[PDB]
């Protein structure tokens, strides 16, 4: 029902999904005036991220992004509750304007952004149940820029051709998801915000790593050109591009940083 | 109730009552290199009748969303494919703790504030309201405002703010030369097809954003950011008129054309 373009684009989400017009909306611009060091922001530990090579994980095109399903034995340690993984997915721009991260830093978009979605499995039985509840979700965000070829990201990207159309699926053999994370994961931005897609629930604890990863210009072009938001037999195909939300106002609030220099 | 820039009636909800706010060609936008293209046909505009007589006076009104100055229809811009006559000017700004309230951004950066001088196609239409619902019915000039030196010209407006503090209030401003509000090198500008930045968000505006900003002082910005209320003088739930700018919009395949190549 919802899209990133045309009549059903982001300014219209609030019609069907009232939280998209509510409080605590993400993404935001991360800029100096609103950052504040917080010594409580100790390093997260990424447990069960080294997925069994003997297991397969489902990659899907759901018409909005490409998503990889993740097992609940994968979790973040270091928050008050255990947050167990549910899925990862990406956001990107287009070849004419290849700057499609969701979060910005000092007003600047990165080329793309990876989100690893987790839910509070101490309090809730599954992500769908957690998604509208207090302390429900935690998302890790990795900013992506163009640079050297990244073999780890290619463990996902090499399957994109098999998920070109909405509803298509592919199986991805387990690999170490921590390989998708940047250098010095101890350095991150932290704030309370929302899902960046409908229903936009304000239930996400965001962790945006300070440092970006790189992927090659060919990898970024593949991501931007491989997918459609329509079914294979749609007589009016639509490319899956520019699948990021514009930044939201963020007033009288701070983003906390784990770094001081 | 009535549309605002904050809370349940804020900009993500405008489309619920004003469908064009969720439609195509929306403004403002971020002006950045990937979407700019030089166009040598973008020749200089001519500002005609901008020198308003100091012996005449012009109505300043707080309309609940901004402060606007009414302008006479003998003021026009020449150089477009019709003559466009002025109707009003108004501003957008941030707040005292965050003076970063321009609408358009440049390479992801907000300016302190923004002036819009709204014109309508007087060759074709009898009034701006009629023009507002027609293709290229409106032409808006935008001036980006930076915190810097005191600006005596802008103070010709700002010195009257304590007299239009509440919605519906009106004051008179003696005429002055409106071209004094424009920046250096007006020949250098960005041009694109967009919309009103407020409900009803009509996609009927030819935008001209000048390349160079003007400066007003910190004290001028603070006055602008503290003087005004969105609400009537007797409202038991007053709302400060702050942060009256829309977030930038997706570009939806549009380019912005520049009169400068570098
Ligand atoms: N950016 S995000 O991390 O806030 C995020 C998403 F962007 C998206 N959209 C994918 C990105 C689109 C452009 O790249 C999804 S979804 O695909 O499940 C939505 C539609 C399902 O019919 C979720 N899923 C959450 C919210 C919805 C319900 C399920 C449980 C919790 C996780 C999510 F958390
Ligand atoms: N930013 S803008 O240039 O798109 C713009 C405005 F922002 C606004 N609102 C002031 C800005 C509020 C926040 O600073 C106005 S208005 O006040 O006349 C009427 C609306 C309620 O306010 C017009 N004027 C046009 C609107 C439509 C029809 C009537 C005739 C004049 C043209 C306009 F073109
Ligand atoms: Zn996401
Ligand atoms: Zn305006």
Identify the structural domains of chain B with CATH numbers, from first to last: 2-261 (3.10.200.10)
Distance CA A125, CA B37 (A): 53
- Closest among A149, A88, A85, A84 to A113, alpha carbons compared: A88
Two tokens, residue A133: 């509840």
Q: A114 in helix, strand or coil?
A: strand
In which residue are the tokens 């997260």 written? A44
Give the residue whose CA is nearest to atom 24 of ligand 2: B118
In which residue are the tokens 């915190």 written? B147
Query: What residues of A act catalytically?
Result: 64
- Which residues is A146 bridged to in the sheet? A215
Listing DSSP states for A42-72 in one string gives PPPEEES-B--TTSEEEEEE-SS-EEEE--T
Rounded to a whole number, what is the distance in Å from the CA of B24 to chain A's nearest CA? Answer: 6
Contact B224, B6 (CB under 8 A): no
- Interface contacts (A, B; CB < 8 Å): 73
Two tokens, residue A113: 């952004």
> What is the experimental resolution, given in Å to one decimal place?
1.2
Beta strands B138-147 and B214-216 are parallel
Q: Which residues line ion ligand 3, judged by CB < 5 Å?
A: A 115
> What backbone torsions phi and psi does residue A157 show, to the nearest 5 degrees?
-65, -25
Contact B146, B207 (CB under 8 A): no
- Which residues is A68 bridged to in the sheet? A59, A88
Q: A145 in helix, strand or coil?
A: strand
Distance CA B110, CA B101 (A): 7
SS (H, E, C) B39-108: CCCCCCCEEECCECCCCCEEEEEECCCCEEEECCCCCEEECCCCCEEEEEEEEEECECCECCCCCCEECC
Contact A174, A56 (CB under 8 A): yes
Altogether, the residues listed in chain B come to a count of 262
Shortest CB distance from A11 goes to which of B21, B97, B109?
B21
B59 burial class (0-12, 13-18, 19+ CB within 10 angstroms)? middle
Contact B15 A11 (CB under 8 A): yes
Minimum-distance ligand to the CA of B243? 2
Give the residue whose CA is nearest to atom 29 of ligand 1: A128
Separation of CA B105 and ligand 2 centre (Å)? 19
Distance CA A13, CA A6 (A): 12
- Closest among B185, B204, B27, B184 to B132, alpha carbons compared: B204
The count of other CB atoms within 10 Å of the CB of residue B210 is 22
Shortest CB distance from A99 goes to which of B34, B95, B248?
B34
Rounded to a whole number, what is the distance in Å from the CA of B104 to chain A's nearest CA? Answer: 12
Catalytic residue among B65, B76, B110, B119: B65
Two tokens, residue A180: 């998708």
Show Cβ contacts of residue A215 under 8 Å, excluding neighbours closer than 6 positions.
A111, A112, A144, A145, A146, A147, A149, A150, A153, A223
Q: HSE-up of B7 (CA within 13 Å, CB side)?
A: 6
Contact A5 B252 (CB under 8 A): yes
CB environment A26-46: b (16+ within 10 A), e (fewer): bbbbbbeebeeeeeebeebeb
- Closest among B21, B23, B82, B30 to B209, alpha carbons compared: B30
Contact A97 B21 (CB under 8 A): no
Where is the binding site, in residues of B?
90, 92, 116, 197-198
Which of A5, A11, A200 to probe the B interface (max B CBs under 10 A)? A11
Q: Which residue of B has its CA nearest to A18?
A: B13
Q: Which residue of B has its CA nearest to A98?
A: B34
Separation of CA B129 and ligand 2 centre (Å)? 10
Ramachandran category for residue A249: left, alpha or beta (phi over 0 → left; psi -120 to 50 → alpha):
beta
Q: B8 in helix, strand or coil?
A: coil
Q: A37 in helix, strand or coil?
A: strand
Taken in order B126, B127, B129, B133, the sign of the CA dihedral is: positive
- Closest among B60, B52, B71, B182 to B128, alpha carbons compared: B71
Q: Which residue of B has its CA nearest to A97?
A: B34
Ligand 1, atom nearest to A62 Cα: 17
Distance CA A244, CA A104 (A): 11
Separation of CA B49 and ligand 2 centre (Å)? 22
Show Cβ contacts of residue A94 under 8 Å, excluding neighbours closer than 6 positions.
A100, A224, A239, A241, A242
Which of B5, B8, B15, B101 to probe the A interface (max A CBs under 10 A)? B15
Contact A162, A229 (CB under 8 A): no
Q: Is the peptide bond before A199 cis (omega within 30 degrees of 0)?
A: yes
Two tokens, residue B65: 């969303």
- Which residues is B106 bridged to in the sheet? B31, B109
Q: How far is CA B12 from CA A28, A245, B241, in A?
A: 14, 12, 18
Two tokens, residue B215: 């400066």
Q: Is the CB of B244 under 6 A from ligand 2?
A: yes
How is chain B split among helix, strand and coil, in percent rounded to 5? 15, 30, 55
Give the rounded distance of the alpha carbon of A117 from its chain centre: 7
Contact B79, B113 (CB under 8 A): no
User: Which DSSP state fits A228?
Assistant: B
Listing DSSP states for B237-259 in one string gives S--B-----PPP---TT--EEES
Distance CA B28, CA A19 (A): 24
Distance CA B190, CA A194 (A): 35
Distance CA B24, CA B138 (A): 16
Shortest CB distance from B247 goes to which of A14, A22, A247?
A247
Q: Return the H-helix or E-strand segment holding B174.
A: strand B170-174
Minimum-distance ligand to the CA of A129? 1
Contact A242 B249 (CB under 8 A): no
Distance CA A118, CA A136 (A): 9
Two tokens, residue A61: 């095109």
Distance CA B224, CA B94 (A): 9
Q: Which residue of B has its CA nearest to A108?
A: B108
Two tokens, residue B37: 């293209």
- Closest among B235, B246, B218, B258 to B96, alpha carbons compared: B218
Q: HSE-up of A101 (CA within 13 Å, CB side)?
A: 24
Q: Is the CB of B201 under 6 A from ligand 2?
A: no
Residues of chain A contacting B, Cβ within 8 Å: 4-7, 9-15, 20-22, 25, 29, 33, 96-99, 104, 106-109, 242, 246-249, 251-252
**Distance in angstroms between the alpha carbons of the first and the last residue of chain B:** 46
Q: A18 in helix, strand or coil?
A: helix
> What backbone torsions phi and psi does residue A50 show, to the nearest 5 degrees?
-85, 80
Contact B6 A249 (CB under 8 A): yes
Residues of chain B contacting A, Cβ within 8 Å: 5-6, 8, 10-16, 21-24, 26, 32, 34-35, 95, 97-98, 105, 107-110, 243, 247-252
The count of other CB atoms within 10 Å of the CB of residue B125 is 18
């Amino acid at each position: 029902k919802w899209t990133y373009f045309g009549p059903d684009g982001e300014n219209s989400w609030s019609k069907k999904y009232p939280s998209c017009g509510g409080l605590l909306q993400s993404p935001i611009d991360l800029h100096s005036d609103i950052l504040q060091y917080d010594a409580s922001l100790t390093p997260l530990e990424f447990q069960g991220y080294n997925l069994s090579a003997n297991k397969q994980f489902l990659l899907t095109n759901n018409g909005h992004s490409v998503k990889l399903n993740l097992p609940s034995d994968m979790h973040i340690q270091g928050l008050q509750s255990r947050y167990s993984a549910t899925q990862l997915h990406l956001h990107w721009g287009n070849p004419n304007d290849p700057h499609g991260s969701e979060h910005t830093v000092s007003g600047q978009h990165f080329a793309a952004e990876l989100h690893i979605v987790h839910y509070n499995s101490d309090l809730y039985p599954d992500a769908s149940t957690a998604s509208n509840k207090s302390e429900g979700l935690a998302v890790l965000a990795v900013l992506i820029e163009m640079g050297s070829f990244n073999p780890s990201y290619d463990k996902i990207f090499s399957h994109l051709q098999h998920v070109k159309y909405k509803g298509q699926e592919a199986f991805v053999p387990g690999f170490n998801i921590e390989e998708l994370l940047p250098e010095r994961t101890a350095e991150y931005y932290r704030y309370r915000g929302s899902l960046t897609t409908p229903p936009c629930n304000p239930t996400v604890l965001w962790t945006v790593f300070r440092n970006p990863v790189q992927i090659s210009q060919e990898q970024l072009l593949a991501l931007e050109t491989a997918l459609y938001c329509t079914h294979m037999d749609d007589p009016s195909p639509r490319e899956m591009i520019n699948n990021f939300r514009q930044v939201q106002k963020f007033d009288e609030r701070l983003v906390y940083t784990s770094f001081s220099q």
